[PDB]
UniProtKB/Swiss-Prot annotation:
Name assigned to this protein: Tyrosine-protein kinase Fyn
Subunit structure comment from the entry: Interacts (via its SH3 domain) with PIK3R1 and PRMT8. Interacts with FYB1, PAG1, and SH2D1A. Interacts with CD79A (tyrosine-phosphorylated form); the interaction increases FYN activity. Interacts (via SH2 domain) with CSF1R (tyrosine phosphorylated). Interacts with TOM1L1 (phosphorylated form). Interacts with KDR (tyrosine phosphorylated). Interacts (via SH3 domain) with KLHL2 (via N-terminus). Interacts with SH2D1A and SLAMF1. Interacts with ITCH; the interaction phosphorylates ITCH and negatively regulates its activity. Interacts with FASLG. Interacts with RUNX3. Interacts with KIT.
Role played: Non-receptor tyrosine-protein kinase that plays a role in many biological processes including regulation of cell growth and survival, cell adhesion, integrin-mediated signaling, cytoskeletal remodeling, cell motility, immune response and axon guidance. Inactive FYN is phosphorylated on its C-terminal tail within the catalytic domain. Following activation by PKA, the protein subsequently associates with PTK2/FAK1, allowing PTK2/FAK1 phosphorylation, activation and targeting to focal adhesions.
Compartments (UniProt record): Cytoplasm; Nucleus; Cell membrane; Perikaryon
Bilayer-crossing regions: none
Gene name of this polypeptide: FYN
Post-translational modification note: Phosphorylated at tyrosine residues, which can be enhanced by NTN1. Palmitoylated.
Family stated for the protein in its record: Belongs to the protein kinase superfamily. Tyr protein kinase family. SRC subfamily.
Portion of the full sequence shown: 84 to 142 of 537
Tissue-specific expression: Isoform 1 is highly expressed in the brain. Isoform 2 is expressed in cells of hemopoietic lineages, especially T-lymphocytes.
Length: 59
């Protein structure tokens, strides 16, 4: 289970970066190293690069 859980919302005022909310789930897709990964949601279907290093999965 490499699924990440949303913690809170974020205020992104850019083009690359996007805003998101909690209660959603993000699927893996990117595999560079550990920085800005994509956020694939099976809900809205909106991508965006953000730092989801402050979150955590569910065991």
């Amino acid at each position: 289970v490499t699924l990440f859980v949303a913690l809170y919302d974020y205020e992104a005022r850019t083009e690359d970066d996007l805003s998101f909310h909690k209660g959603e789930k993000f699927q893996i897709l990117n595999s560079s190293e550990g920085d800005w990964w994509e956020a694939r949601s099976l809900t809205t279907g909106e991508t965006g690069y953000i730092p989801s290093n402050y979150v955590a999965p569910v065991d």
